[PDB]
Ligand binder design. Structure first.
Ligand SMILES: [Zn+2]
Ligand SMILES: [Zn+2]
Lengths: 315, 315
């Protein structure tokens, strides 16, 4: 006969009242529920819990299912449980600020998240297509990174304490992003006999390339056999972007400030699962090894992602 | 001046000829390339490698990019490298057949893949939307599971040697599947004052439910506060399916054959990362603990996924 009124949400915006008894578990009476970070599905409602807001993760109403699809986009059924679990596990992590630069301190093999996050921090005019990603992005810019860390890990299928691939995660996250201004990428494919074909990429698709790590290797002419029997070529003919991200496999490269490289920053893989985020500032390389800075003018390192400023190119 | 002709593919169907010198790496001249399982991007082409078929993973032509989008569906840029790497790492795994039942032997924390695969093996009339998933599914049914294991791991973002969640992977894989016949799921939401709302689910969406582990808990009436001030209910009103998969959080349940349960099979989590696939056959529970069988009539276990036969229900 004793009951408690609880408020149920999936978004912290819309709430439904559920009347619960104190003779059965939360899982039996309602479903998977989180309260102030912890999963209380296997607990029996306590009189003190009346009026509290609970986060449900399964057995959602039609209205809850729609709100979820609009907030997170299409997600698998375990998404909410993984996101709320991640959010709780990641709470103790520390974002430190070294000379106004936010870096994720080392804990539970999170070093790849440092390279990912610090790289996203340099990407000008990027909005997130998924509202929940945009809210956590904005909270991260304000000084509270928990939501963003957990959502990236949730969308990337990253396990707490497990090492991962920075490039994998960066591109996965960036597939859910949009560009505020406009960008173009024109790849011309041709045979002097068969004809010319132009392929046009717009938005942030024009700002990311995987398989090349220099603007020279990007702009280089590619040649292979044509159907006619002659030569077929592929070459980048137009490129207009607010920034440029080029990614590749760990590749030894002597990085020096003496030649003033056109790139702004780069990530490095060291080997297991170790990542370092480097930036070019004041004629130096600032190496951010998970909330630990080190400055050098020259570095021979296994380069992965390389960030360049805006492109204004015509072949 | 010495050159070799190599054949480049992303699908083993369409091939392009590339002329390569023996004075530069494969990565420099073409890109990320795999040959007979191994990544040879950092090797210099050898005269003996002329006429061989190479699998490229980055710097794809427009025609290769389109063929890839049609074969695998939209995938992140690291997909091919992870799939080819996984394919190579997983080669030594063994599928054993115990009394005509295929089960994945234990190796590199693959136990969750055993629960996933053995569960998919019972799902009648399922086709895969993504062609590459359908080809590997068909190869798996024929006795060669490598491609299927690696693709599930590739789409699920599973790392070789790392433990994972069977339910996560099952639903992820099943989101890329379709049903050959037809299924219906009708959820009625109502207030005796505000009115009735029917929500209809079709295909294999009507065959999967997360948050409930019994057909009784599924069919149970859910009640919460309506906007009007009265009671609002949610109840399953129609259900027609060729099979039914119900998933939940590990939940202790005494499973007995004495009551002849309506379900056909179920998965169990034991705890870390350990999974067991159980089937109901001949008045017994056959426990498949990664290519190891054990028979019992009663089992008190932390049940996750539960598979039921076709549903023919009207409330
Ligand atoms: Zn031609
Ligand atoms: Zn009402």
């Amino acid at each position: 006969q004793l009951t408690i009124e609880v408020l149920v949400t999936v978004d912290g915006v819309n709430f439904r009242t559920v009347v619960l008894n104190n003779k059965n578990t939360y899982r039996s009476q309602l479903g998977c529920v989180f309260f102030n970070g912890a999963d209380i599905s296997d607990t029996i409602p306590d009189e003190k819990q009346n009026g509290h807001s609970l986060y449900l993760a399964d057995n959602l109403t039609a209205d809850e299912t729609k709100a979820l699809k609009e907030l997170y986009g299409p997600v698998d059924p375990t998404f909410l449980h993984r996101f709320y679990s991640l959010k709780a596990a990641v709470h103790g992590w520390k974002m430190v600020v070294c000379d106004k630069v936010r870096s994720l301190k080392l804990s539970d093999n999170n070093c790849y998240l440092n390279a990912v996050i610090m790289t996203l921090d340099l990407l000008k005019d990027i909005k997130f297509v998924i509202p929940a990603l945009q809210h956590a992005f904005m909270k991260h810019k304000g000084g509270d990174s928990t939501d963003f860390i957990a959502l990236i890990m949730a969308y990337g299928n990253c396990t707490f304490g497990a090492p991962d691939d920075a490039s994998r995660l960066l591109h996965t996250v960036l597939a859910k992003a949009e560009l505020c201004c406009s960008a173009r990428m024109v790849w011309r494919e041709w045979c002097n006999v068969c004809g010319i074909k132009d392929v046009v990429l717009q938005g942030l698709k024009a700002c990311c390339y995987v398989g090349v790590q220099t603007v020279e290797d990007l702009r280089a002419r590619m040649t292979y056999v044509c159907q006619c029997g002659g030569e077929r070529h592929r070459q980048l003919v137009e490129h207009t972007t607010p920034w440029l991200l080029l990614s590749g496999t760990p590749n030894e490269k002597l990085v020096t400030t003496s030649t003033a490289p056109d790139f702004v920053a780069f990530n490095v893989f060291q080997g297991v699962g170790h990542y370092v985020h480097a930036r070019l500032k004041g004629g130096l390389i600032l190496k951010f090894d998970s909330g630990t800075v080190s400055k050098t003018s020259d570095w021979k390192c296994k380069v992965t992602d390389v960030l360049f400023p805006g492109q204004k190119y015509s072949s």
